[PDB]
Structures are given as structure tokens and as C-alpha cells.
Design a protein around this ligand. Sequence first.
Ligand SMILES: Nc1ncnc2c1ncn2[C@@H]1O[C@H](COP(=O)(O)OP(=O)(O)NP(=O)(O)O)[C@@H](O)[C@H]1O
Ligand SMILES: Nc1ncnc2c1ncn2[C@@H]1O[C@H](COP(=O)(O)OP(=O)(O)NP(=O)(O)O)[C@@H](O)[C@H]1O
Ligand SMILES: N[C@@H](CCC(=O)N[C@@H](CS)C(=O)O)C(=O)O
Ligand SMILES: N[C@@H](CCC(=O)N[C@@H](CS)C(=O)O)C(=O)O
Ligand SMILES: [Mg+2]
Ligand SMILES: [Mg+2]
Ligand SMILES: [Mg+2]
Ligand SMILES: [Mg+2]
Lengths: 481, 479
Amino acid sequence: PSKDQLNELIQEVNQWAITNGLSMYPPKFEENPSNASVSPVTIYPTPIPRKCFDEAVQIQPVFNELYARITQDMAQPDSYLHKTTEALALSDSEFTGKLWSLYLATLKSAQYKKQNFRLGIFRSDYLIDKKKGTEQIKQVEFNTVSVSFAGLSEKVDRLHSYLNRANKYDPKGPIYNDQNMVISDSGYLLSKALAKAVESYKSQQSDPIVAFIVQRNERNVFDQKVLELNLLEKFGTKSVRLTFDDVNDKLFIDDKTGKLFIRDTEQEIAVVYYRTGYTTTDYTSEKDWEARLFLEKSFAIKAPDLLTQLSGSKKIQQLLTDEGVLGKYISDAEKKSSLLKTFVKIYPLDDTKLGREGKRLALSEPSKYVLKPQREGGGNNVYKENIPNFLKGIEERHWDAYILMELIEPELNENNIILRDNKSYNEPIISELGIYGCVLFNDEQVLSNEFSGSLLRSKFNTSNEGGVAAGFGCLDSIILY
Amino acid sequence: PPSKDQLNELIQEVNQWAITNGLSMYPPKFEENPSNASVSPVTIYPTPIPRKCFDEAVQIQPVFNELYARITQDMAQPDSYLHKTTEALALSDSEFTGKLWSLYLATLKSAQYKKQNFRLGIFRSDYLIDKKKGTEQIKQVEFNTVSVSFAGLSEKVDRLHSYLNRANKYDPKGPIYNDQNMVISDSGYLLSKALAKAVESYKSQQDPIVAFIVQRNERNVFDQKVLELNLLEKFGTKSVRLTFDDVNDKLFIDDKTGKLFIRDTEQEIAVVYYRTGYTTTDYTSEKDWEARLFLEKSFAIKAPDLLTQLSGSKKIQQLLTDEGVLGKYISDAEKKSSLLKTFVKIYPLDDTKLGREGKRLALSEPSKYVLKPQREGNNVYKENIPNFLKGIEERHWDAYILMELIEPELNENNIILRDNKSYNEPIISELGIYGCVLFNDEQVLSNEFSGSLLRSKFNTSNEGGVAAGFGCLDSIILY
Ligand SMILES: Nc1ncnc2c1ncn2[C@@H]1O[C@H](COP(=O)(O)OP(=O)(O)NP(=O)(O)O)[C@@H](O)[C@H]1O
Ligand SMILES: Nc1ncnc2c1ncn2[C@@H]1O[C@H](COP(=O)(O)OP(=O)(O)NP(=O)(O)O)[C@@H](O)[C@H]1O
Ligand SMILES: N[C@@H](CCC(=O)N[C@@H](CS)C(=O)O)C(=O)O
Ligand SMILES: N[C@@H](CCC(=O)N[C@@H](CS)C(=O)O)C(=O)O
Ligand SMILES: [Mg+2]
Ligand SMILES: [Mg+2]
Ligand SMILES: [Mg+2]
Ligand SMILES: [Mg+2]
């Protein structure tokens, strides 16, 4: 775009975004939460092959079923996966081990029937791998807890649709075919899933609510608000926002039924939906771990419960790459095949046959991999030629704290513009396709399993006047081709 | 009354719902970073308004629309009292009215194309609920004929309060209000529908757009955006935002047809909708006055055009209080009576008989009035009136009107929220009713009620300062 065209387009974006709540709190918003900023976004949609997008959408229920079955297997105290997971958890005592200890505590006898239905609100993330001309969605990871952006996704998609249909991209007319402009309904669909869990809770017995368990001073609250509003306006269901402090201070469990209530209001909580509790810093003291256990012991349906959260571990992602292991959870030949083609090679770094080969590859051909820690979210992946130096810096026995993953090689989009805090950036971006999926299941049955929308997160990483390794992520949208 | 904790939670509920829904405004100096905005100043709860009063205000709007459409049509005629009255006002206020009048005269010159005679009045009638000796009656503060605000944010504050009620935020145990009594304005949609109607009239005379003429660095952009989005999503009509600089730099008129176009895009403008040009500071140089004349001479339908804007003067408001004058525009006895019931006494301060009566009253019983400058925060109230008048030459008192003071009851049970701070102060609430009327030199083609608004404000001397206070958007609970 010209200089003047870009500036007018930027103000069109800020204006539409603010009018529609496509927003996020800035750092230190605590000082004045009556103000918010436009969420970081691209100005144009990013091209994604229609074949790739359709494949991602179609396989989501298969992934939902797979992770539900894995969770169910983990839920059997006498199973091999239960032992396997305990072993992995004990290796990460500061986080995974604490989650595991809470889970063991839920196995103790209760005076009431326990809640066995759980809701998995998931997101499968992909990079479109391009090797020797073959284009194939490849899974980066599978998210099983507190997945973000279902609400803002709907809004960035509608922002770009608007700019196209309202002749803002070009005053003479649309520059895109609206039939190729993806418009996610992920906000509505996640709310529908939460309502489904409420339906399940009621069927086991009243105007129960959904308790949103949130991070203290959460900056991404407007993304979450879309779900709170949809639950009320579309599903007539109320909700509350509770931090771990609020859980400890305001909730109680009825000893005879296990039902969860807000003390001074008598509101009954049907579903505990987590938007916090996925990284060590989310638990600021032993009291927060106690709060999580309290919620997990109650009769409310958790979204997700402890085991479902634990099923999304990098170790399990690695394990599933073995066709024999996969087949213990998905026996359908075609589903199994469909799943395997979205996987790249992933190796453990332990003393097993596979682990020894991973160690050999990590040192001999590091350029082809990314070393990823089993404890998630720390932003500590180690790439390519940097791998040997990192590994040599720690005892070989501790290499098991990581997995070695084949590097996915997507094409970069060189024709988009990123907007953040009224500043634009013309840099090449990598785009990660997210597909939401929600599955309601218990110890053995699966009651609802659906595709729940899409997301496209893009980011750039460059060294320029903005700094070395400058760059950040933003919400993008999809134009199919 | 909310406890500290309950109020603090309710305040965050409001901030969160407001930001998520665009119930927002730019703060001062937002120009430094327009990617950031604040929650609009709003009340936490709705304010009680008698159902009878609300219904009366809604039902009378089309009558006021017709009245001002007729006044505007009369003003076009050289021999009418109004035409003449306006001329005098153009001398008294040559810096503003005088300049608008001169532009109007300039539009009377011949053109080589057929001129556009349809105009769209997007009005708002504002009321205070007078309470004198147990007599409850809506009384008109003023009638606004140009660039009326808040139709978009009105919808949102009404929906904010409805949500707080239905989502058990006002009370965790259930709703505290009957939803049947909670007014939910559709003024954003209805103003957009009126603009679409003007577009329809423009097309009937031949994919044109609506040009929003806006103030440079407008802080109330989100209120306007509601209309832009509705025009597109509900009426498939595009629009652009243009300051007077943009009008001068980017638009041209086809000499043969008078049609208005954006130069390099070829977009055709069907309607010129003003959200600026109502006060002297909106015209920063002669170039802005020229930009206004350029738009007015074009074939686009103006909302409002020059004469329609001029019809909403305080002088005309004063003249209409005489039944004989009103009767020149409204012949229906019942419509006439309904209008008169909403008027308080209003006097000139010139040397006409009524004016000399006004002067007597202003000095003998000032406590019953408010002195208002004819040019549109300069009102002078009650006992402060004599001192103010004594300070200016009597011959210039004609620059004001003397209006009976409306005395509403204050709502002492609401909380005002702005920039995260709450204020628990009594407020006065002014009911606004929007109305849109499409008309030409003689016919009135569409005339509708277009929604509601409730603006509240407080004024106190306390820890926040002397005469501290500001206005905010409120909502209505009927009873
Ligand atoms: N195999 C891969 N090939 C190429 N890039 C990758 C690969 N794996 C991860 N990445 C990049 O690294 C980012 C973070 O890796 P990811 O597995 O999502 O991390 P995390 O530790 O799980 N944290 P979080 O996303 O916050 O839960 C991704 O979004 C990608 O940009
Ligand atoms: N007759 C009255 N009785 C009581 N209060 C009044 C009266 N007239 C005006 N006011 C108050 O004064 C405010 C401003 O007066 P108003 O006539 O609305 O102003 P203005 O000069 O037309 N400008 P604007 O509203 O910015 O276009 C009103 O909203 C009222 O609060
Ligand atoms: N707590 C935040 C952020 C949660 C988060 O980090 N989610 C990651 C991991 S699942 C995502 O990629 O969505 C929220 O609720 O939006
Ligand atoms: N320029 C601003 C403000 C216009 C304005 O001041 N409107 C007054 C006078 S009509 C109102 O009371 O609505 C906007 O367009 O929102
Ligand atoms: Mg990730
Ligand atoms: Mg992760
Ligand atoms: Mg006013
Ligand atoms: Mg006025």
C-alpha cells in the first residue's frame, strides 16, 4: 500500500477493532483497567491452501477422540500409561509432579459419588511443511488446557472480512473472494461446548453456572469475555471469574454430594473452566495447589480435569509417533493413517533404543531438529546447530527432560503487515494454524466430539532498528486458495 | 447500596463488558496513540423515568420532526418572519450564524445542474422532567438539528445495564429489575436506517456512499463507528470519514450534474452526513467554510443542509412558544396542544413587548430562570442573572434568551463511573429522543422516531473540587 493508504487502513483497523472489542490489556493495566489496546493483528489475511485447511478441520475430531482415549487409559490406576505418566511427572517434581500428586489425592475415597465426566477444550496447532514440493500440515503440538483466542479469532476474521467487503483494502471494491475468507465461529463453539458440559452436569441430577478460573491480572480478558457473554446470551448460562484466591476464599463443597457452591450467593457451579493453571508461575503458593485440588475433588465437571491436562504432554506426543502405540488408542486404519501423516519424527532422549538414536541424531545432525523441554510454556526451545552446545552443558541423564523434534519447514508469507500499538511492521511471517475441538467424555464413553473453529497465529523474528531478535506474535486470518 | 467489594467487582464487570463491546471513547491527546481507548463515562445502574413521560416523549418526536421540517421549508421563503428573524440573528452572530447564512445565500445562485432539494434532518429533542407542585411533565431543554451524538453508544449503555441485570451482576441471586421496564434503544440502527433512506431518495433521482464529515481528532469516534458498520452490514452501503481538509483536497463536483465524487477512487457520494460544523471552532479557516459551501452546492443530500441546521436556533425555540407562531406550522389542534405542553416560558430580551416583559422578569424574579446565549457552557442561572446583564450593554441583551428554569428531581441512588473511579453523587438526567425526517422544499417523505438517550451529570463541591462534575451515559428504567 502507498504511505497514505497504509495509514488510513491502520486507523480503519484501530477503529473497527476498538468498536468490536478486538482488544487486550497492555502491561501494567492494573493501574487503570478502564483502558485497553487493539490486539496485535495482521492487516491482511495470510494464504493457506484449501486442501491443508480442510484436512486440519476434518482430523480434529480424530485428535479429540485420541486424547480422550489416552486420558481414559491414564485414568486406570493399574494401567501401563498411569505408571508411565507417574514416572514422567516425578521427573518434573516442581510442576508435572505436583499436578500428579494432586491427581493421586483425588483417588482417595469420598463420601459422595465422584464426577467422572470431563470436558476437553483442545487446540491442535500446525505448520504447513514444504519439503521437496510436498505440502503437508504437520502438528507442532496438541494443547489440552486453557487454549487461547477462540473469542478474538472470530473478531480478527470479521475485521479482515469487513475491510474487504467495505472497500477499505481497495476503495474500488473487494480484493478477495469472500468464499475464500475463513470466518471462525470458535467463540460461539467453545461456549456451546461449555453449555454441553453444563447439560451433562444437570443430567446427573437448578440454574448452575460456569466458573472461569482465571489468572490474577489476566491481560487477555476480552478474549475470555466473548465466552462469558455467549454462555449467557446464547445459552442462558451465568458464570463468574475466580482466581485461585477467590476459590480458596469464596467456595465450599457440600460434604454429602460433593457439589461446588459460592458461599455468600449459593450459586452452584456445574463446570470449572480453566484459563490458568498451565505453568508453574500460575501457582504462587501452596494455597493455589490446594485450590486446584479442591476444584478437582468437587462434583463440578472440569474443563479440563487433571488427567486431561496431563495427556497433552510432549512425552505423549513423542510416544504417539510409534504406529504400534497409536494403534492402542485408534484402531481404525484410515484415522490412524490420517493422524500419522500430520506427524514429523519425534524422539525421546533416554536410554531406550529410540532414545539412543535421538541422542545420536541430536549430536550428528542437529540442523534438522528443535530440542523441546517436557515442562511447557517457558519459551526455551533450542534450535538446530545450537542443540549440541546446550546438551553438552547438562548431564546426559537430564537429557530425558527434553524431546528431539524434526524441524517443520513452512514457507514464509512476505506480503502481510503486522500492526501493534499503532506501529506497523513489514516483515516475513510464519503462520501457525490452530484448530479448536471440544470433547465431552467420562471414564469409558465419549458423549460429544466436535470441531470448534480455527485460529491463525503469525509472528516474525528479525534483527533491525527495532532490536536483535525483535518480533512478536499476532492474530492473523486465513484466505484459502 | 453496594458494599465496597461488591462495587469494585461490579466496576470491573462494567469495564470488561464495555471494552468487549466498544462502549468507548478516546481520551484527551489520544492522537499520540490511537490504538488505545477508554470505557465511556457511564452510570452503573439505570435511572428511573416515569413510563408516562417516556411514552409522551417518544410519541411527540414525529410532531417535532414535522414542525422543524416545516420551519425549514418556510425559512426558504424571502418574506417569512422566520427568514427575517434569521437575518437579524446573522448580524448579532456574524462570526457563526452570519457565516452560515452567507453560505446559504450563495447556494441560491444559479447552477448549470438541477439542484438537490431533499435534505435529511437527524434530530434529537432533549427533555428534563419538570416537577412543580406535584405536576410531572417533560419539558424541552432544546431541540438539536445538527450533528446529534450518542445514538451508537446509547444502544451499548442500554445493553450494558440489561446484561448486568440478566447476568446476575447487580445481584448474584437474580435480576433486580423487571426486563419489561428496561429501555433498550435501537438508535444506532435507526439512524443508519434514516441515512439509508436518504441514499434511497438520492438513487431515485438518477453504488453511492455516505460521507461522514468529521471533526479533526474526534474523540467520540466509536459512537460514529456504530453507524458506519450498520450502514454496511444492514444496508449494504459503504461510507468514508472526511474532515474539511479531506473535502477540500479529495472531492470534486461534476459541473454538468453537480454530483459529488472522491477524486481518485471515483466513489459517488449520495449523502453528506455532518458530525462537525456546529460550532465556530469546527471551522478553523475560511477554507473550512468553503468546504462546507462546496458540499452544500453539490447534488448530495445533506444531513442536515444549511437551512435545516439554522432552524434549530434558540431564537426560534423562543418564538415557537407563542401559539400563533406555532400555529403557522402545526394546524392540528391536538398536535399543537401536545407541543405546547412540553414548553416552559421563554422570552426575548429585546425591546419588543415580550422582550420588555423578559427584561422585567430577568431583574425582578431571576431565581425562576436561566439566561442562555443564542450561540451554541455559558448559561447563567437564577440569582446570578442580574449581575451578568448589568455587566453588558442593554442593547446586547438580545444576544440571549430568558428561559424558565425546569426543576426535575435528582436521582440520589446511582453511581457514576469514569476512568475507573466511581462517584456517588445526585444526578440530573436529560432524556433525549432521536427522530429523522426526509423532506424537500414542500413535501415530507419519511418521518420517524429513531431511539432514545439518557445523559446524566452531577455538580458538587467536595474533595474532588468546587463545581466538580461531568456528564455520562445513563439508561432508563420505567415505572
Ligand atoms: N517442530 C517444529 N518445527 C518448527 N517450529 C517449531 C517446531 N516446534 C515448535 N516450533 C516453534 O515454537 C513455538 C513454541 O513451540 P511449542 O511446542 O508450541 O511450545 P510450548 O513449550 O508448548 N509453549 P505454549 O505454546 O505456550 O504452550 C511454536 O509455536 C513454533 O513457532
Ligand atoms: N430551562 C432549563 N432548566 C433547567 N436546566 C437547563 C435549562 N436549559 C438548559 N439547561 C441546562 O443546560 C445544559 C446546556 O443548555 P443547552 O440549551 O442544552 O445548551 P447549548 O448552548 O445548546 N449547547 P449544546 O448542548 O452543546 O449544543 C442543559 O443540558 C441543561 O442541563
Ligand atoms: N491465560 C491466558 C493464556 C493461556 C495460554 O497461554 N494458552 C496457550 C497454551 S494452551 C495457547 O497457545 O493457547 C488465557 O486464558 O488466554
Ligand atoms: N462532534 C461530536 C460531538 C457533536 C455534539 O457536540 N453534539 C451535541 C450537539 S447536537 C449533542 O448534544 O449531541 C460527535 O459527532 O459525536
Ligand atoms: Mg504452542
Ligand atoms: Mg504447549
Ligand atoms: Mg443541549
Ligand atoms: Mg445546542
